[PDB]
């Protein structure tokens, strides 16, 4: 069956490329939301707010 499928070939390269783009896009989305600041300000110990 793999040999029969092999004559298509470009279809699955296309599909895997699309899904890879989607995955990269998700990691993008998380980065752009949460990684706004690249300085990890630790909370103060004393809560005199």
């Amino acid at each position: 069956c793999s040999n029969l499928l092999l004559q298509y070939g470009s279809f699955c390269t296309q599909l895997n490329r699309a899904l890879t783009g989607i995955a990269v896009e998700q990691d993008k989305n998380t980065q752009e939301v949460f990684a706004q600041v690249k300085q990890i300000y630790k909370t103060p110990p004393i809560k005199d707010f």
Partner: protein, 42 residues
């Protein structure tokens, strides 16, 4: 018959990037063609 023999253990050698043949008889240029066939492994 020949009897002046001196047997030795079978000697081995690494074959690399060898055993590739044109898989068809079609002219094809500037193409990254892929094939599946009986090929000599690298």
């Amino acid at each position: 018959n020949l009897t002046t023999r001196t047997q030795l253990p079978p000697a081995y050698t690494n074959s690399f990037t060898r055993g590739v043949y044109y898989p068809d008889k079609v002219f094809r240029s500037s193409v990254l063609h892929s094939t599946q066939d009986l090929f000599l492994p690298f």
